[PDB]
Structures are given as C-alpha cells and as structure tokens.
Design a protein around this ligand. Structure first.
Ligand SMILES: [Zn+2]
Ligand SMILES: [Zn+2]
Lengths: 27, 27, 27
C-alpha cells in the first residue's frame, strides 16, 4: 500500500496579547 | 502505515485593539 | 507503506482583548 495518511492539522495558535494602552484622557 | 505527525503550528495571533480612553483631567 | 508525512499548518487564533486604559487627562 501507499504511504500512511498525512498527519492532522498542526496545533492551534494561542490568542493574541492585549492591545496597546488606550488614549490618554481628555483635558 | 500510520498517519504522520501533526502539521506545523498555527501562525502567531494579533494584538487586541487599543484599550479604553482614560478619564478627564481635573475640572 | 511508511508512516505518513506531517499534516497541514495549524489554524490561526483570535486577536487579544483590548489593552489597558489610558491615564487621566492632565491638570
Ligand atoms: Zn505498499
Ligand atoms: Zn503501510
């Protein structure tokens, strides 16, 4: 027979990091 | 033959949006 | 046949959450 099947998809990535700080507050 | 290994890891995720605006300065 | 090859790339992940708040506005 042929080679075995391709493996499964790779591991999921993890969630990204928090975004930047928000804008400084208004005067 | 058996299945192959899992594939390559998923690509790194993106940062979130900027956070909330800060509050006003003093009156 | 032989063991199969590695699978396809893993999936992308969610972006991160909103960042920290900005600081108070100025005096
Ligand atoms: Zn064969
Ligand atoms: Zn085989």
């Amino acid at each position: 027979g042929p080679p075995g099947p391709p493996g499964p998809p790779g591991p999921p990535a993890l969630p990204g990091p928090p975004g930047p700080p928000g804008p400084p507050g208004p005067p």
